[PDB]
Amino acid sequence: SLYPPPPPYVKFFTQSNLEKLPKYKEKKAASAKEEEITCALDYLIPPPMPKNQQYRAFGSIWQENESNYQYKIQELRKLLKSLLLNYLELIGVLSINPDMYERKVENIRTILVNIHHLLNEYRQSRESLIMLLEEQLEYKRGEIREIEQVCKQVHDKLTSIQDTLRTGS
């Protein structure tokens, strides 16, 4: 069907199984002193994390104070200059002998592809943390400073009123 069937073990665990789970896990721990499914109550025991700390799904694999970059910068600049130079040479190829133009085209793309690699090491979450950091920091400083400004102006008004009433005495 369109919707896959519920998992099979879901139907094994009734309320009685839930209430008898404590004694079952106590007995299992006492006896113990891929997990084989010898009893229907085994699944409620929390599954163990794989030792390799890896998870595979759909053909793809998955697994501290914030809780020479100049070399990369100059590499990027020289790569951009070489990319412009190669673009000029490739368009010249198109001009004179376009029949073999593709011979350079993908080459240029490789440099562009390398640029993407040069982005990968530069990857930005810390920079986003920084920018959010300063925006809420400056917002709270603005709120604070307007607080002492308003309380100070109220105090100044109170002192002026006190002087006015003392003069009228």
Binding site: S67, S128, I147, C151, K157
Partner: protein, 56 residues
């Protein structure tokens, strides 16, 4: 007396204890969780949450 009464009211409008519990909750929530898992999860959601302009 009237004008100082509205001054009192507007000062009371700006917050006491509630703000300090909220700041506390922020501090233990930040201390409990490590930045590595948060950054990894942010990177993994960057593709899904952010709609690219070229997605027809």
């Amino acid at each position: 007396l009237e004008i100082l009464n509205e001054c009192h009211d507007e000062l009371k409008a700006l917050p006491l204890e509630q703000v300090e519990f909220e700041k506390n909750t922020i501090l233990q929530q930040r201390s409990k969780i490590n930045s590595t898992e948060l950054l990894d999860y942010a990177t993994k959601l960057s593709k899904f949450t952010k709609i690219p302009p070229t997605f027809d």
